């Protein structure tokens, strides 16, 4: 599923992302935007370390989800990476929350530091009623 901007913003808010661990909805939207363009079945294989990013947030399989083929990987979200390729994002949001419970917070995603940090993210939530 490829979400429309405001449609996703309400979905995330509904799921408890607004200000989760101090991370506003705008920052989450900016992350989803630059990671997958709001697409849940987005996947990117990493040939260098044999890992794969899955879903709307492009969560990597080395540490977060089990796909059975990433060498020495872990499953911190207790989820099959397939769960992050669903149209319903509940599981991907629960995994995203787990990621930010770690020391780095929203900084875990380099794309966030690249395209969202110290930037004007108001535009992602304007007019969405969130």
- Domain range list for the chain: 1-130
Resolution (A): 2.0
**Cα maximum dimension of the chain:** 44
Beta bridge partners of 48: none
Beta bridge partners of 46: 51
Name the residues annotated as catalytic.
35, 53
Beta bridge partners of 111: none
Beta bridge partners of 52: 45
Solved by what technique?
A: X-ray
User: What's the topology of domain 1-130?
Assistant: Lysozyme (1.10.530)
Query: Residues 10, 130: contact at Cβ < 8 Å?
Result: yes
* Beta-carbon-side half-sphere exposure of residue 87 (alpha carbons within 13 Å): 2
* Residue among 31, 34, 39 at smallest CA distance from 89: 39
Q: Count the Cβ atoms, other than its own, within 10 Å of residue 3.
A: 22
Query: Residues 56, 42: contact at Cβ < 8 Å?
Result: yes
d(CA 120, CA 26): 9
Query: Residues 94, 77: contact at Cβ < 8 Å?
Result: yes
């Amino acid at each position: 599923k490829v979400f429309e901007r405001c449609e996703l913003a309400r979905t995330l808010k509904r799921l408890g992302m607004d200000g989760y661990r101090g991370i506003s909805l705008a920052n989450w939207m900016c992350l989803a935007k630059w990671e997958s363009g709001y697409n849940t079945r987005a996947t990117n294989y990493n040939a260098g370390d044999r890992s794969t990013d899955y879903g709307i947030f492009q969560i990597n399989s080395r540490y977060w989800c089990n796909d059975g083929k990433t060498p020495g990987a872990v499953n911190a979200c207790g989820l099959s990476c397939s769960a992050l390729l669903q149209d319903n994002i509940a599981d991907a949001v629960a995994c995203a929350k787990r990621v930010v419970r770690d020391p780095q917070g929203i900084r875990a995603w380099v794309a966030w530091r690249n395209r969202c940090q110290n930037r004007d993210v108001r535009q992602y939530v304007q007019g969405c009623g969130v």
